[PDB]
Design a protein around this ligand. Structure first.
Ligand SMILES: [Mg+2]
Ligand SMILES: [Mg+2]
Ligand SMILES: [Mg+2]
Ligand SMILES: [Mg+2]
Ligand SMILES: [Mg+2]
Ligand SMILES: [Mg+2]
Ligand SMILES: [Mg+2]
Ligand SMILES: [Mg+2]
Lengths: 167, 258, 170, 59
RNA sequence: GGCUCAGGACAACGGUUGCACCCCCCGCGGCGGUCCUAGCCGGACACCGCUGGCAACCCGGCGCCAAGACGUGCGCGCAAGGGCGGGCGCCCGGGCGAGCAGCGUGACGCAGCGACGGCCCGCCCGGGCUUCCGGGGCAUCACCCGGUCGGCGCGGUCGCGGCGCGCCGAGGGCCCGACGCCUGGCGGAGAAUCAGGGUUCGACUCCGGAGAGCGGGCCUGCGAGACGGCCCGCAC
């Protein structure tokens, strides 16, 4: 099946090597999870029997995760509304596919329920008084079956705002 | 490539120091995993059949062991292929024979008869200090033994004294210049001597310089240097004091014996 | 005062580096937590660096630098382990990589003579070094960084452009 | 539900030896936990001139 | 374990490094605290009895009954993953040559053990890859490569990596013989020959690699892309 063995590649000089054995089970891969944001249908997580009896769980559909505000040391569970930027490709954003590094929009209710009454970063307050906050995904969906992350702040937040402003 | 581990062992591929006859057969005993590794151990059956001669075949060893007629570190063992290593305790109460397994000068296993005063403890080498679950310190030894909560003064490469009945440290001898050692690896297995110098090369091995009691000097790496006391061995050792004679003297001794 | 000047150069870099909109993603150093740059006081270190050891010294450029390189041995997250070798630079057309030429000797017993051989070895060059052709470099082994790369530069002596090529085993 | 005499042997019935076995197992487990606890406490009493890092028991 | 040497020529293999990029049954030694009827829980199937199909191979329907089997499960908080937590030119303990392990703390989630108590950790054998050096002939084969060369990001993997995908740049190898073609090409430890220097061979005893008519795919399992295991196409 799918494999990542190097026997099927070329040499540094661009030459064909030649195959000297059949395919082996250490060098195998699997079809990507393609985790979809929900926006019969519900949180669906499957399990995979890996090498040595280990268990690897990949998520197919999900909608909630744990997020943090490092500067204010605030951490709660929120709902992810949609994905809005991804460096790798725009197709993933249109299809709302969850992967590490995707910039998402979360709801503000769990945070505004306790914020807007303490001196903090101005921009985070502006997001809080709205209906969504810019955040990022830090976990690896498809390997641990979870979608955690942290709230943006600083130069990177400016970078992403400048990137998605014209749209 | 074999699809799994190896369960056999050709006689011609066996370690040299086991002293197995070429015509004995195609196969040789395969030691099982335990206190010591394949190349740093010897099976029980070899001691009990090819040396002491209390048995003539595999079956007799099987019956003797399954009847529980041998003790190892105070524990009866019933596996003919159980591995016996270095600084171990061998007891057969039926004939009141107590042995500690050490190395001879020529580089082969031997049995040193001992007394009852010192058969309640063994010496072990510490070569790994690490943090376990919850962060609780541990340590390991050359015989696959783990002890929880050691004294901070104990460091790596040291030597530890532990009671057979209870795995509780009694005393520890440090690794330092001016201490008697016993070599246990390579060309100089079995030689007894005192340390003189220590030279370290970053990222690689560490070499130890020792001088025999008669003035001979030799070297080896730190992975096969064992401490046996402070200036004097703590345990009883074979008749000879770890002196490797030359070929001329060995030939003379053979001629005398013939 | 020296610390205050350093932070501004470090702090300032992360700004226009963000305005460099051509980049697909915001490049950052993993160890640091973005948010310290908002602290007006110099209450937290803005840059991360380590010591390679083996008797080597961290160049001032990395410490006073402003670049990002995950594969750099000083400011990145890779370690040097194994064999240390020496060679000369053969090519430097790649982005952050070079080709190092190594010279040795082979002995043929029948004719009781030697032959001169050479090999090509690829290495990753951190932005903390300036190197041209014919310079002498010291490379340290690391984990696979690519298809043909397992080495990273740690030192480099300079050389003059005019210098008759000389077979130089090291 | 409520010559040789053949009747089935019974199963799942509790006899004294099982009660004794369960009680002994509980006692041994409690003893083991207590021994580990006191060893840890003695170790912590020691190390009065150094540092420690261990998992605190919550609850 | 045993048989063979078809395939394969910077590969395999031989010596030498590393995993601070890894997995690991038996065995040995430790450790063992589990969130919200416990004098002992529930239902099945096998063999077996009655009843039957078909040339053979194969199985059907009803029926009470057993578990160190299956399922639930009493219990002192605990799996995986994730955020924050060091320095001011360099150097001068848990451990290192090397800021690596562990821990605390803010949030997620209730994984594993438990109706005669073992999840977990260390060692061992083994495996995977990886540094350096060696590794057939023809120039009536002189230019070759285009995921080919590097960078950034994600996915997948026991795991690093153009291993796969998207974007960007252009690159890499060569008379110290690339690339291409051929080989009645398994390799080494070794064998034959005989002043010394060497020539030829190396199916076969030991180590390693590959295969089970050709080409592919997969379940069980710690471990197999296994064939005295199954599925497909082709030739018999
Ligand atoms: Mg519970
Ligand atoms: Mg059960
Ligand atoms: Mg052939
Ligand atoms: Mg063979
Ligand atoms: Mg096969
Ligand atoms: Mg097959
Ligand atoms: Mg057959
Ligand atoms: Mg078979």
């Amino acid at each position: 099946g799918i494999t990542h063995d190097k026997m099927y590649k070329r040499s540094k000089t661009g030459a064909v090597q030649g195959k000297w054995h059949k395919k082996r089970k250490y060098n195998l891969g699997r079809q990507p999870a393609n985790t979809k944001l929900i926006v019969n249908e519900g949180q669906k997580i499957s399990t995979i029997r890996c090498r040595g009896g280990n268990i690897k769980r990949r998520a197919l559909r999900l909608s909630h995760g744990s997020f943090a505000w490092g500067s204010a040391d605030i951490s709660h569970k929120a709902r992810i509304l949609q994905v809005v930027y991804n460096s790798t490709s725009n197709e993933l954003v249109r299809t709302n596919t969850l992967v590490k590094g995707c910039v998402v929009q979360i709801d503000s209710a769990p945070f505004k329920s306790a914020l807007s009454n303490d001196t903090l970063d101005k921009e985070i307050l502006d997001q809080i008084r709205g209906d969504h906050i810019l955040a990022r995904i830090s976990s690896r969906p498809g390997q641990v079956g979870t979608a955690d992350g942290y709230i943006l702040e600083g130069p990177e937040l400016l970078f992403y705002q400048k990137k998605l402003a014209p749209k | 490539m074999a699809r799994g581990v190896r369960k056999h062992l050709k006689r011609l591929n066996a370690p040299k120091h086991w002293l197995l006859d070429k015509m004995g057969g195609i196969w040789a005993p395969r030691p099982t995993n335990g206190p010591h590794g394949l190349r740093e151990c010897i099976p029980l059956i070899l001691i009990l059949r090819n040396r002491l001669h209390y048995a003539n075949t595999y079956a007799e060893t099987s019956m003797i062991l399954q009847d529980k007629n041998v003790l190892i570190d105070g524990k009866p063992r019933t596996d003919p292929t159980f591995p016996v290593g270095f600084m171990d305790v061998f007891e057969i109460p039926k004939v009141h024979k107590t042995f500690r397994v050490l190395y001879d000068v020529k580089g082969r296993f031997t049995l040193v008869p001992i007394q009852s005063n010192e058969a309640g403890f063994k010496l072990c080498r510490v070569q790994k200090i690490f943090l376990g679950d919850k962060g609780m310190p541990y340590l390991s030894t050359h015989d696959a033994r783990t002890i929880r909560f050691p004294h901070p003064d104990i460091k790596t490469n040291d030597t530890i004294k532990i009671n057979l009945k209870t795995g509780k440290i009694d005393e520890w001898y440090k690794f330092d210049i001016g201490k008697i050692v016993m070599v246990t690896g390579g060309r100089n297995c079995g030689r007894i001597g005192t340390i003189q110098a220590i030279d370290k090369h970053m990222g690689s091995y560490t070499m130890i310089r020792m001088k025999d009691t008669e003035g001979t000097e030799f070297l080896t790496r730190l992975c096969n240097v064992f401490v046996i006391g402070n200036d004097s061995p703590a345990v009883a050792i074979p008749t000879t004091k770890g002196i490797r004679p030359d070929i001329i003297k060995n030939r003379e001794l053979r001629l005398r014996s013939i | 005062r020296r610390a205050l000047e350093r932070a501004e150069t470090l702090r300032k870099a992360a700004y226009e580096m963000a305005e460099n909109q051509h980049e697909r993603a915001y490049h950052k150093q993993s160890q640091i937590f973005q948010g310290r740059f908002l602290r007006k006081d110099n209450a937290r270190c803005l840059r991360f660096y380590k010591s390679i050891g083996m008797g080597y010294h961290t160049p001032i450029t990395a410490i006073n630098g402003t670049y990002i390189d995950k594969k750099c041995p000083f400011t990145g997250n890779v370690s040097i382990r194994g064999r240390i070798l020496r060679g000369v630079v053969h090519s430097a057309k790649m982005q952050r990589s070079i080709i190092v030429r190594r010279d040795y000797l082979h002995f043929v017993q029948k004719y009781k003579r030697y032959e001169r051989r050479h090999k090509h070895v690829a290495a990753h060059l951190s932005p903390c070094f300036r190197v041209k052709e014919g310079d002498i470099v010291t490379i340290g082994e690391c984990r696979p960084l690519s298809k043909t790369i397992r080495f990273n530069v740690i030192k480099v002596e300079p050389v003059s452009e005019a210098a008759k090529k000389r077979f130089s085993p090291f | 539900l409520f010559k040789k005499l053949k009747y089935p042997k019974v199963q799942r019935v509790v006899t004294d030896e099982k009660y004794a076995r369960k009680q002994r197992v509980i006692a041994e487990k409690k003893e083991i936990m207590r021994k580990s606890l006191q060893q840890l406490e003695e170790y912590k009493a020691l190390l009065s001139r150094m540092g420690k890092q261990h998992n605190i028991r919550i609850y």
